[PDB]
């Protein structure tokens, strides 16, 4: 039928001026272009077919050829930036935007998908899709009282494409585009389909991956409670973007971080900081590090939620990149914490795993640990208890490691190490 045509035959059919011959040739192109094993994208491009496909998107009396070319162009646009650029170069962006209004749901959906691929290429094509006015028709497809009346795959496609309009930096998406999209995004973030939740949550993570003003737009929409709820989900595909979004938000101001805490996020961290997925633990610990960089009352809520033992645990045993985030969380904690909070940290057992990580070859983690120890000694000074900490560090082999760090190549490490020797082990 239309199975395994040559590109040359596809060209012959598409260059006939017979719409039905063109349809069958376009379907044959679609079938080539949708095979998983090496779809001949560049051959189709090189045969000059993209402009014909784009012209077929406008064949209103001819919805099957609209669909077939939309699918063909979608998969071409799914490839490299050069392959996506060829689709854009053929005029596909306004054609696909016009196709969003198709009364045929499967065609509308295919145009949604193709625009998602185009926008997914990068900020430039994302902004170009926005400039051609994709957002209004995309959002109009979701302007129903209850998202649950929409077809499942259709809604997931719309969510995914919207998330690509929220994606990428240098530049971030246009502020008015974000403002226009956000209420619908918030709708999707409360939907019951796990894939819609995951992609909405990714979209929110992109929007919060930026300056405090970007974070504020999201936080002001009141999504933090829902993010915290998703943070506790059982599905890893939902926890991951929820944790990234929460982690992004706490890189913001202390007040933005406070929303995260007020929404109850800290109660999820016993599980997050022991999560068997390495990247969850790492990003939970990174998130903790930006919370312990907060105000003393925020450190206190970390304490109250029982999270210092969990930091001790991650410091004691975790993927090394997670232990690095934990070292940072401790240094931030000891930099901003009260004497009592820092004392509490020692009582939880921080010293020995902190010492054990001074054997790491990573130069940066050593400075982080040395600085935390400095901060802990300064707290010990204020209680006249310096020497007890010196014994503690002595008894677990920490002083041996600090001594040996005088012999470290890095200047700031050898310095900070020799200082620690000069003030507390003399």
């Amino acid at each position: 039928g239309t199975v395994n045509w040559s590109v040359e035959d596809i060209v012959k059919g598409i260059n006939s001026n017979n719409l039905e011959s063109q349809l069958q040739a376009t379907q044959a192109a679609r079938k080539l272009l949708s095979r998983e094993k090496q779809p001949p994208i560049d051959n189709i491009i090189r045969a000059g077919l993209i402009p014909k496909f784009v012209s077929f998107l406008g064949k209103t009396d001819c919805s099957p050829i609209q669909f077939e070319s939309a699918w063909a162009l979608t998969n071409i646009a799914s490839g490299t930036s050069e392959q996506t650029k060829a689709v854009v170069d053929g005029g596909a962006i306004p054609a696909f935007i016009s196709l969003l209004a198709s009364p045929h749901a499967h065609i509308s959906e295919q145009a949604v998908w193709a625009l998602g691929n185009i926008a997914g290429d990068g900020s430039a094509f994302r902004d170009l899709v926005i400039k051609h006015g994709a957002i209004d028709p995309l959002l109009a497809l979701l302007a129903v009282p209850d998202l649950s009346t929409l077809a499942c795959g259709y809604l997931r496609n719309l969510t995914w494409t919207l998330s690509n309009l929220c994606r990428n930096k240098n530049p971030a998406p246009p502020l008015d585009a974000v403002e226009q999209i956000l209420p619908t995004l918030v709708r999707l973030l409360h939907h019951n389909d796990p894939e819609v939740l995951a992609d909405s949550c990714w979209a929110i993570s992109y929007l919060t991956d930026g300056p405090n003003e970007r974070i504020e737009m999201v936080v002001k929409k009141g999504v933090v409670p829902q993010l915290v709820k998703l943070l506790g989900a059982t599905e890893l595909p939902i926890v991951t973007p929820a944790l990234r979004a929460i982690g992004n938000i706490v890189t913001g101001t202390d007040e933005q971080t406070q929303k995260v805490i007020d929404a109850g996020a800290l109660a999820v961290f016993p599980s997050l900081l022991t999560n068997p997925k390495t990247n969850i633990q790492k990003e939970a610990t990174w998130t903790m590090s930006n919370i312990t960089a907060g105000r003393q009352d925020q450190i206190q809520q970390v304490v109250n939620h029982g999270l210092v033992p969990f930091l001790v645990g991650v410091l004691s045993k975790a993927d090394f990149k997670t232990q690095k985030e934990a070292a940072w969380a401790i240094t931030n904690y000891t930099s901003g914490g009260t004497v009592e909070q820092i004392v509490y940290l020692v009582h939880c057992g921080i010293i020995e795993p902190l010492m054990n990580l001074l054997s790491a070859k990573d130069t940066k983690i050593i400075q982080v640990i040395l600085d935390a120890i400095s901060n802990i000694f300064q707290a010990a000074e204020k209680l006249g208890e310096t020497e007890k900490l010196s014994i503690m560090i002595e008894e677990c082999g920490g002083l041996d490691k600090i001594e040996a760090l005088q012999r470290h190549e890095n200047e700031s490490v050898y310095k900070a190490s020799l200082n620690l020797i000069e003030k507390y082990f003399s």
Partner: peptide, 11 residues
């Protein structure tokens, strides 16, 4: 994570 671009295999 997730996919910047999606290839349509079927349906």
């Amino acid at each position: 994570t997730p996919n910047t671009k999606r290839f349509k295999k079927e349906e």
